[PDB]
Amino acid sequence: PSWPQILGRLTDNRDLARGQAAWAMDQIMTGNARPAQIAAFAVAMTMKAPTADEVGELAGVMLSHAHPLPADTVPDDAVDVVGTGVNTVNLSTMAAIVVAAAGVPVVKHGNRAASGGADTLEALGVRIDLGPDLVARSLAEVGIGFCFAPRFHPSYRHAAAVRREIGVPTVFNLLGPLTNPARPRAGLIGCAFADLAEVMAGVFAARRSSVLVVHGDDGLDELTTTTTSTIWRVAAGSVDKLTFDPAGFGFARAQLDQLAGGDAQANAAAVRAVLGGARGPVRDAVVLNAAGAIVAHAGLSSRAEWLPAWEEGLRRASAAIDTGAAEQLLARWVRFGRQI
Amino acid sequence: PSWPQILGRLTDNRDLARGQAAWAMDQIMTGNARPAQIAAFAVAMTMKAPTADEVGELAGVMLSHAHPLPADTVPDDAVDVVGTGGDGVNTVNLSTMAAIVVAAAGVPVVKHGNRALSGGADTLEALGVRIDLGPDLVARSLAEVGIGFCFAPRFHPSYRHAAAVRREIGVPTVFNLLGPLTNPARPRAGLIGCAFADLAEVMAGVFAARRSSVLVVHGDDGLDELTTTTTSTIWRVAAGSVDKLTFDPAGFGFARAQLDQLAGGDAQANAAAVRAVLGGARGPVRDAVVLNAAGAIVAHAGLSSRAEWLPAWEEGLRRASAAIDTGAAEQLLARWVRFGRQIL
Numbered sequence: 001p002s003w004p005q006i007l008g009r010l011t012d013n014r015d016l017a018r019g020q021a022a023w024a025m026d027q028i029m030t031g032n033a034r035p036a037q038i039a040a041f042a043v044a045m046t047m048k049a050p051t052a053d054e055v056g057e058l059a060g061v062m063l064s065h066a067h068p069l070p071a072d073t074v075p076d077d078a079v080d081v082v083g084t085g086v087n088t089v090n091l092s093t094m095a096a097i098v099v100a101a102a103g104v105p106v107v108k109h110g111n112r113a114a115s116g117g118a119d120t121l122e123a124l125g126v127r128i129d130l131g132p133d134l135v136a137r138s139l140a141e142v143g144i145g146f147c148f149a150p151r152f153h154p155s156y157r158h159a160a161a162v163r164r165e166i167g168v169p170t171v172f173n174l175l176g177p178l179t180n181p182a183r184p185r186a187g188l189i190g191c192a193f194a195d196l197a198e199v200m201a202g203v204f205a206a207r208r209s210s211v212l213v214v215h216g217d218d219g220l221d222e223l224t225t226t227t228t229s230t231i232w233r234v235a236a237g238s239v240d241k242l243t244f245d246p247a248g249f250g251f252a253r254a255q256l257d258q259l260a261g262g263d264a265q266a267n268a269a270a271v272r273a274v275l276g277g278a279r280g281p282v283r284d285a286v287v288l289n290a291a292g293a294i295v296a297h298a299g300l301s302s303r304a305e306w307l308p309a310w311e312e313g314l315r316r317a318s319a320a321i322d323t324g325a326a327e328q329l330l331a332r333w334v335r336f337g338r339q340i
Numbered sequence: 341p342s343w344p345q346i347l348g349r350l351t352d353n354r355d356l357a358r359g360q361a362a363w364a365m366d367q368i369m370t371g372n373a374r375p376a377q378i379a380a381f382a383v384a385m386t387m388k389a390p391t392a393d394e395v396g397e398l399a400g401v402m403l404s405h406a407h408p409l410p411a412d413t414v415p416d417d418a419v420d421v422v423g424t425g426g427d428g429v430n431t432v433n434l435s436t437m438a439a440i441v442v443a444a445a446g447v448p449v450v451k452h453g454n455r456a457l458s459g460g461a462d463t464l465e466a467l468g469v470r471i472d473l474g475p476d477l478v479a480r481s482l483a484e485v486g487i488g489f490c491f492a493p494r495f496h497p498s499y500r501h502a503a504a505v506r507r508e509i510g511v512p513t514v515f516n517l518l519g520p521l522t523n524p525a526r527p528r529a530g531l532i533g534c535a536f537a538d539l540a541e542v543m544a545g546v547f548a549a550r551r552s553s554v555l556v557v558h559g560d561d562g563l564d565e566l567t568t569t570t571t572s573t574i575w576r577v578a579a580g581s582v583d584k585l586t587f588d589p590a591g592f593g594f595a596r597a598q599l600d601q602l603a604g605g606d607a608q609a610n611a612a613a614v615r616a617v618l619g620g621a622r623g624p625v626r627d628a629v630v631l632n633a634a635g636a637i638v639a640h641a642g643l644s645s646r647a648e649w650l651p652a653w654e655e656g657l658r659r660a661s662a663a664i665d666t667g668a669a670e671q672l673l674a675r676w677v678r679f680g681r682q683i684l
C-alpha cells in the first residue's frame with residue numbers, strides 16, 4: 001500500500017479496498033504522513049464520498065492511539081450529546097447538562113472553537129482540560145464529564161494542523177463524534193448534511209450503539225424547532241430512518257435566527273438564562289434535544305417504544321430545568337473543578 | 341479570497357469564480373502556500389474537473405513568474421511537440437524523435453521539459469545534447485540549429501514549491517496539464533499528446549483561447565502521442581474553435597503495430613533507438629515518429645494557411661519521411677550536439 005495507490009483510487013472516484021483507509025490513518029497518527037499527503041487524502045475522500053466502512057477504519061485507528069479512561073469507570077449506559085458543527089447558541093452543551101440533571105450519565109467530547117462547546121464551558125467556570133482519572137471522578141461525583149480532545153488524542157496533532165491550514169470541512173470532521181475516548185454506547189449526534197448522516201449512522205450501527213443521528217430539514221446539526229428533522233434511529237446493529245415532527249408534541253414553529261449565539265460569553269449567558277427558567281425557542285430546542293438523548297439512552301436498557309419514550313423524554317428534560325436540577329448540576333460541576 | 345473559500349467551492353463540485361484559480365496559483369508561485377494547501381487545491385481541482393478558464397488562469401500566472409526569452413528570438417511560427425506523459429506505458433521517446441524530424445523539415449521547434457524510465461530531457465542528454473541552458477543560448481540554438489530546449493526547472497524556478505508537493509502525493513493532477521501551456525517560448529502551434537481524453541478537450545480549450553494552431557491528440561489505446569497500434573482522437577484547434585475527430589493511420593497505408601514494439605528503456609536504450617531511426621531504420625518506431633512529425637507539421641501549416649486536412653497530412657508525411665531519408669534529421673541532431681559543445 002502507498003499514497004499514490006490510495007490517492008489514485010480516490011481520485012478515480014473508487015471506494016478503497018479494506019484496510020487502505022486504516023493504513024492511511026495509521027500513517028497520519030504516527031507522524032509518517034507529510035502534510036501534503038494528509039491534505040490530499042482528506043480532500044480526496046471527501047469528494048469521492050466516504051462509506052461507513054471507510055469511516056469506521058479511520059475512527060478505529062484514531063481510537064487505538066487515544067488515551068483511555070480507567071477501565072470500569074464509565075457506566076455501561078453513558079451518553080454523548082454532540083454535533084459535527086450557523087453561528088448558533090450551544091444547544092448541545094445545554095442539552096448535555098439537562099440530560100445529566102435528569103439522571104443520565106453524560107460524557108462529552110470536544111475542543112476549543114473551530115464559542116465552541118469547550119469555550120462556553122470554560123466561560124461558565126467548568127474546567128475542561130482534565131486527565132482521565134478526574135474525568136472519571138467527575139462522572140461518579142457529578143454525573144457528567146468532559147474529555148478535552150487534544151489531551152486524549154495527542155497523536156492527531158499532524159492532522160489537526162492540516163485541518164487548520166486548509167480550513168475546508170472534510171471527512172475528518174466526522175471523527176469527533178466517533179472518537180469519544182469514554183466510548184459511550186448511546187448518544188444523540190447532530191449532522192449538518194443528510195448524505196453524511198446516513199454514513200455516520202452506519203458506523204454506529206456496526207458498534208451496536210443506541211444512537212439517534214439527527215439532521216434538521218433546515219440544515220441544523222441538532223433536532224430543530226423550525227421544521228421537521230430526519231432521524232436515523234440506530235439500535236442492535238440496524239438503522240430505522242424516519243421523519244420526525246415536533247409539532248406532534250406541541251412545539252411551536254420557530255425561526256432559525258431565534259437560535260443565534262455569539263461569543264463564549266453570549267452563549268454562557270444563554271445557558272444561565274435557560275437553566276434558570278427562561279421560556280422561549282432556545283429552551284424549546286434544548287428540551288427537544290435533551291429528550292432525544294434520553295430516548296437514545298433508553299435504547300440501551302428499556303424495551304420502551306418510540307412514542308412513550310419521547311414522552312418520558314420530554315417530561316424528564318422539562319422537569320430537570322423547572323425543578324432547578326440542571327442549574328444545580330452546573331453549579332456542582334463548577335464546584336468540582338475548583339475543589340481540584 | 342482565501343483557501344477556505346476556494347477549497348470549499350471545489351469540494352462542493354462548483355466551478356470557481358473568475359480570479360480564484362489565479363489567486364491560488366499566485367500564492368503557490370510566491371512561496372506563500374503551505375504544502376497542505378497546494379495539495380488540497382490540486383486534488384480538489386482535479387476531482388471537480390477543471391475548466392479551460394481555470395487552467396488558463398493557472399498557466400498565465402505561472403508564465404508571469406517565468407524567466408523571459410529575449411525579444412525577437414523566437415520565430416513567429418515555432419512549434420512545440422510534447423505530451424503530458426504519465427500514460428504509464430514506458431515507450432520510446434516518440435516526441436523527442438518527431439521534434440528532431442520536424443526541425444529537420446525546416447519547421448523551428450522549441451521544446452520544454454524536465455527529467456523524469458527515461459524522459460525527453462534525459463534521452464537528449466544521453467545523446468550529448470546540452471539541455472541545461474540560459475535563454476541567450478536557447479535563442480542562439482534555435483537560430484543556428486533550428487531547435488531548442490527550455491529546461492523547465494531553469495525557466496520556472498518559482499514552481500519549486502508545487503513540484504515538491506506533486507512528488508510527495510505522486511498522483512496525476514491538474515498540474516500535469518501545465519507543461520504544454522507554459523512553454524516559455526510561447527509557440528503558437530503544436531502537437532500536444534494527452535494521456536487522458538477527458539482533460540484533452542480542456543487542453544484544447546486553452547489553446548483555442550490563445551488562438552494557437554494545435555493538434556491535441558490521444559491514442560485510443562492510451563498513448564499520449566498519435567498511435568500506430570489503433571486509431572487516435574484528435575482535437576483540431578484552429579481560428580479560436582476546437583473540433584473533435586477520429587483519425588486512422590491505415591488511411592495513409594500504415595500497418596497496425598503492437599504496443600510492445602514501441603517499448604522504451606533506460607536513457608541509453610532510447611538514445612540508441614533515436615540513432616537507429618534517424619539513421620534510416622524502418623519499422624513501427626519510424627512509422628510512429630513520421631506520423632507524429634507530420635501532425636506537428638500539419639499544426640504548423642495551420643498558422644499561415646487554411647489548407648485542407650488530407651493534403652496537409654500528405655505533405656506532412658512526405659516532408660517527415662524526406663527529412664529522415666535525406667539524412668537531414670541525423671545531421672540536425674549532430675548540429676545540435678556540436679552547438680552545445682561550442683558553448684565551451
Ligand SMILES: Cc1ccc(C(=O)O)c(N)c1
Pocket residue numbers: 111149150151153154155156157158160161
Ligand atoms: C481532536 C484534536 C483536535 C486538535 C488537536 C490539536 O493538536 O490541535 C488534537 N491533537 C486533537
Ligand SMILES: Cc1ccc(C(=O)O)c(N)c1
Pocket residue numbers: 454492493494496497498499500501503504
Ligand atoms: C516545471 C518544473 C518542474 C520541477 C521543478 C522543481 O523545482 O523541481 C521546477 N522548478 C519546475
